């Protein structure tokens, strides 16, 4: 659902992805609604609209 859109982790990426096992901290992810991009488009889809 997210591997197939926008940002994955490309070879030319300037950054590190750090993930570790912690059960601390939940919610507050669904506060986004000023960030939306297309699925179906006729006018193209530019990354992270």
């Amino acid at each position, epitope marked *: *659902k997210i591997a197939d859109y926008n940002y994955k982790l490309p070879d030319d990426f300037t950054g590190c992805v750090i993930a570790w096992n912690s059960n601390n901290l939940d919610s507050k*992810v*669904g*506060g*986004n*609604y000023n960030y*939306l991009y297309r*699925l179906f488009r006729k006018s193209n889809l530019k990354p992270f609209e």
Partner: nanobody
Amino acid sequence: QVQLVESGGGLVQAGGSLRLSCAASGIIFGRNAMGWYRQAPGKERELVAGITRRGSITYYADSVKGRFTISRDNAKNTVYLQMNSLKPEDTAVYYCAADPASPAPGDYWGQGTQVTVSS
């Protein structure tokens, strides 16, 4: 995705409106809004209608019409799903979920709700 939380449904009459409520994972919750999937043993599973965030503008297929409206209040951060101008052809099992993706027939999203119109 799965384990969606819904309220509403049951028996309503043709015309009027029915307002459903739903809350869900960030995967569903954070997307356009929540629209409708429906199926019945006489009806193929389809995406009914949706929205591109609150406005006068909402969309629906010509396979199943209805100037359905989807909205979010700020009083409680949930999604309200309102179906307007219902007909008996709308009796189906509904799932209240965002338009991208779709429940698998090899999976089951939340509990769902049953809506029956004039029956």
